Amino acid sequence: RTTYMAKPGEVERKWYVIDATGVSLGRLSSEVASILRGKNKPQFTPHIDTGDFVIIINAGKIGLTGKKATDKIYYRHSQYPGGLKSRTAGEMRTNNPEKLLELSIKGMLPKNSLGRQLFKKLHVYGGSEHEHAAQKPEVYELR
Amino acid sequence: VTSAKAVAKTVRIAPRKARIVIDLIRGKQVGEAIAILKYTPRSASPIIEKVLKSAIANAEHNYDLDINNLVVEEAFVDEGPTLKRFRPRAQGRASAINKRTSHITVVVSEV
Amino acid sequence: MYAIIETGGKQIKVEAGQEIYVEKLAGEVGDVVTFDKVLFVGGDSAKVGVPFVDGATVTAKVEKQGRAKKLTVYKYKPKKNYHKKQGHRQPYTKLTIDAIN
Amino acid sequence: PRVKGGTVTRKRRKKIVKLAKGYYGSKHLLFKVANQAVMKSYQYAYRDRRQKKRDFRRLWIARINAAARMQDLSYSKLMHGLKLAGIDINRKMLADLAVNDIASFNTLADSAKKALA
Amino acid sequence: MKLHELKPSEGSRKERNRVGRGTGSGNGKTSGRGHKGQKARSGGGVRLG
RNA sequence: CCGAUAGUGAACCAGUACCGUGAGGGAAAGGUGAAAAGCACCCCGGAAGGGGAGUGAAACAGUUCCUGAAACCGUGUGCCUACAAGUAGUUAGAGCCCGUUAAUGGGUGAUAGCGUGCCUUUUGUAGAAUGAACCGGCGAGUUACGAUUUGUUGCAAGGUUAA
RNA sequence: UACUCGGGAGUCAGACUGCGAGUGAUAAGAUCCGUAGUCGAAAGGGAAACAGCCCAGACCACCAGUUAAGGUCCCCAAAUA
RNA sequence: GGUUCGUGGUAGGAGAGCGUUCUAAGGGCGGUGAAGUCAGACCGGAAGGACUGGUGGAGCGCUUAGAAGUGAGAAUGCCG
């Protein structure tokens, strides 16, 4: 019958810049994932993309409660025998904050082709300077 | 009126060995297709050459078309009646052998 | 303007001159049907019923009494030798909306 | 008398083969795999004819929640207020209003806010 | 009786039951015999007493 | 009673061909057309085979020759497809292409949710337990004479004949 | 509903879970009994996936509503109560 | 025609039907095209039944009964 289904390009997609100073990693990532998915619009159609673009600055000051800065480990395997490698969360925050935020957010997106398209809409910077001033992004405040 | 054709029914060559040469002269001018068939070293080339020249001849005689403005409109190979033979293997058993035939069709039309 | 009427155990949004398909109603082709259960009238002014907007009705005209396309309901259980086949064809009533009150 | 089996088997198998038009590979050509494909498709249709209603209700709920969070209200609070105010509009119509009659949706949300307090 | 309207007495004739013709009739695979005994075999069974 | 996998093993040069030292075992194989009127003549080719012409109601009836299904092999094209993890479908669905036994129509489908074939045998099988390469034909509770019980019909303290 | 008379059967490899016992080592997805449930012959929702555990019994259609176990930050519907 | 209670299901019991070949009677169609075959978006609660168009080139349905060599996806099934 009669239920509204959106079409590609029919919904405006905006740009946001989010300051990540002091916020917890997961509590920031949940909000950002909801923004990327497009769940904050009454036009939300599950099978297409209606979400927004997100820029995250000051990723080097993201928060980690407890002893997570030393006791949380990130693992990789190269698919070669005995080729497992580890890395602690504080080390990545010091050295590659962008990749820490990207892993955290990527774990919270759907695991299909649409999720892989949504991941490409996230730009993470360790400093306070971004190169997307041409898109005229707005400021988004959490919660 | 505008197309002529000729077929070669139940030629002894197998279809898979003639299709590989037919796939070369499709949609080409006859003057070039004859040279294509003349300089390719396969066993199916003389048969297809004879079929193509027959089609050109009966285009020129039956329908009075211009030779220099002809192209190979379509060419295909169909299966024919196969002959069943045998080959004596070791320890007293025989194995099947298929002596396959084919039908070759080419159609020439002006362009 | 438009209204939200309730008919057939479910609710429908109707505008004037629209064509709608509903559950089978008692009526003949060309008759006049009125809906006395209106939940919401909108368009340049909004009045909400609790649960119904009293005094408001929608008038419609019967266009067709028929049955939908055929379905085939089929069930089976593997390894238990159980199958069951059945065809279905749901009857409907087609209406055209005349006026909203 | 003898009853040889002609004309009856082919007619019955061709219907099943025709029912499997559009299936990959030999599932639309051979009777034995086409039969299994058709049976499985009927079973899947029977199950999804039930799952469709749940799927659409979930979509409507998500859409209403998104539209009502812009009025500083949850879906939970809005639904409670609507029940408490006496309004009996289902999620389908509310989602429609949220999409393309947002003013009327805001009116209903205001009434729900009145009911809560 | 016109020989084209012969209607025999009602209830005097019934339809013979044919076993082993598909699972829709309830007498399909095993044909009313159960599973794998002496009584499921052709000509199988015990004496009268 | 059968109608060319049927009916004799054999509808046709069948106890033949073929197999075995031997006794012996033992097939496959029907149909042009009403009438050969069975394609004079021209063209390509060594020929086969074709394209015209002609005969014929029909040659897409041209010597496995009435009909000519499926597996299988090809040619042309409308929609989709080279960042994707897939019992191959089903439900939601844009875009593009069409136009029917005319009706809330047809084809293909980017993307999203759900989803471990059929049979047999088992307490329990998606099962790393069994069977099947695919398509077609053939292939399994019957008959005679007795026993018992239910239904129907005729007559009824009687009913009924067998050779 | 129960009982009597008559026609027709199939079944006599059971499984796990809670409780009461034996054998075992107060081991076993062990074995053998008593009692109740579920599977067998039962789909649907929850335990990630999962015959036997918890909720609950599919006549068919619906783009309707209220609830059960279990849940409401994101994957994933619903409290960043 | 109504009220109430029901309608998961293996082995298995009971009931009602579809379709195939042949026979009997009535009544039909077919060289202005039969059976078969191919394609469709039609009809019935199921097994199933029509209609239209191509190919085919001489036989075939319908109604009421009766009789069975009576319906195949599997047997390391037989033949092609």
Ligand SMILES: [Mg+2]
């Ligand atoms: Mg099972």
Ligand SMILES: [Mg+2]
């Ligand atoms: Mg006969």
Ligand SMILES: [Mg+2]
């Ligand atoms: Mg058969």
Ligand SMILES: [Mg+2]
């Ligand atoms: Mg497809």
Ligand SMILES: [Mg+2]
């Ligand atoms: Mg629901």
Ligand SMILES: [Mg+2]
């Ligand atoms: Mg019966």
Ligand SMILES: [Mg+2]
């Ligand atoms: Mg049964």
Ligand SMILES: [Mg+2]
């Ligand atoms: Mg079976």
Ligand SMILES: [Mg+2]
């Ligand atoms: Mg058995």
Ligand SMILES: [Mg+2]
């Ligand atoms: Mg046993």
Ligand SMILES: [Mg+2]
């Ligand atoms: Mg037994």
Ligand SMILES: [Mg+2]
């Ligand atoms: Mg025996």
Ligand SMILES: [Mg+2]
């Ligand atoms: Mg024959």
Ligand SMILES: [Mg+2]
């Ligand atoms: Mg014979």
Ligand SMILES: [Mg+2]
């Ligand atoms: Mg000899």
Ligand SMILES: [Mg+2]
């Ligand atoms: Mg003759």
